[PDB]
Design a protein around this ligand. Structure first.
Ligand SMILES: Nc1nc2c(ncn2[C@H]2C[C@H](O)[C@@H](COP(=O)(O)O)O2)c(=O)[nH]1
Ligand SMILES: Nc1nc2c(ncn2[C@H]2C[C@H](O)[C@@H](COP(=O)(O)O)O2)c(=O)[nH]1
Ligand SMILES: [Mg+2]
Ligand SMILES: [Mg+2]
Lengths: 194, 194
């Protein structure tokens, strides 16, 4: 009866796309790269693999490296918006994130990143899972278009958060977008309340 | 429509109680300790704090230390039972665990422990959260008596897994126990199926 909102981390709170591109270019300066505006499809390494052989593996090595997740910059307005959202009456916010398969740094750095931008008390709001459909809530704000898993009927409405990779996608009505944290996330929340 | 079962980690799959006691005694050999049979109440540091001042903090330092979670032994039958359970038709198993507040090692070591005993492919089945009520499923097998959080009506039935700390507790009917992994977990699963 508190409205419950799941907010994805990478591509919603944390600027994974920009951080990746920057780090890829510093480490592989004589390789071709995908400009952010040219990004298409969720999977970064797939697009890089299509661009040139061997490049999928180089791309992967960026996000597998120490400090990659920790050093991601917040997306504009993300921190302010989630902090306001969590302080709203009758509203519980969880940060829901799918860690990569290589687990040496990513889980740790995600907790550390949340501590840095939201504070120790916000660590209680983290959910790490590869399956978001088994987390129940009224809303999921997430930049991945296709969110599936073990539950064929999730309780949340998926609101697509705009990113380079999905900005041109035509969704099936009545699927809805949140265009950036400057867009009116409060009205989306209010539309789900009694 | 696949039956979905959440299986807690510490005190259900991983022998947190035995591992803690062993490590506490090697590190603090001239301190009093709580024998496993004398354990009461979920919170280990609370009982240790009652036993002597300063001892809560020493207890905490054990599970905050590097390799504490990684080096926990599986509880008897736990690995075999969960592997069988996951291979059953129309049955999805997730391992659901609440990491401690100090996040340097615990998340990482939990993924590592799952990889060691269940294999890389089982990493997809991990859910880390401090709030289990927001994970939906038919069953939650968990040794903690009081499982609460943001969802006042969880979709799972909590089956209490026996541990030293809870073995004397009288539950409110119709709450049910799984007494150990030698006990008949298949009949509990079957009672929830259509
Ligand atoms: N394995 C893999 N992971 C990717 C690729 N592209 C992006 N990712 C990462 C970015 C995020 O860390 C993660 C998805 O997590 P999420 O934003 O929580 O849905 O996947 C890719 O091509 N391959
Ligand atoms: N902070 C704290 N954690 C405890 C205490 N006793 C046990 N724990 C840990 C054991 C597990 O790692 C964790 C509970 O996780 P879970 O088994 O998933 O419900 O809490 C205690 O007194 N204080
Ligand atoms: Mg994302
Ligand atoms: Mg437990």
């Amino acid at each position: 009866r508190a409205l419950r909102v799941l907010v994805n981390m990478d591509g919603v709170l944390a600027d994974f796309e920009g951080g990746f591109l920057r780090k890829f270019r510093a480490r592989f300066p004589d390789q071709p790269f995908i400009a952010l505006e040219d990004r298409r499809g969720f999977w970064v390494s797939e697009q890089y693999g299509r661009l040139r052989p061997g490049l999928s593996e180089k791309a992967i090595s960026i996000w597998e490296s120490k400090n990659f997740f920790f050093e991601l910059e917040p997306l504009p307005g993300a921190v302010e918006a989630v902090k306001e959202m969590a302080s709203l009456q009758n509203t519980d916010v969880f940060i829901c994130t799918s860690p990569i398969k290589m687990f040496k740094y990513c889980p740790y750095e995600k907790y550390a990143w949340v501590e840095k931008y939201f504070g120790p008390d916000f660590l209680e709001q983290i959910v790490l899972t590869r399956d978001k459909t088994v987390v129940s809530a009224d809303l999921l704000i997430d930049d991945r278009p296709d969110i599936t898993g073990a539950e064929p009927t999730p309780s949340w409405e998926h609101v697509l958060f705009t990113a380079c990779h999905n900005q041109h996608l035509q969704l099936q009505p009545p699927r809805r977008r949140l265009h950036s944290w400057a867009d009116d996330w409060k009205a989306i929340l209010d539309s789900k309340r009694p």
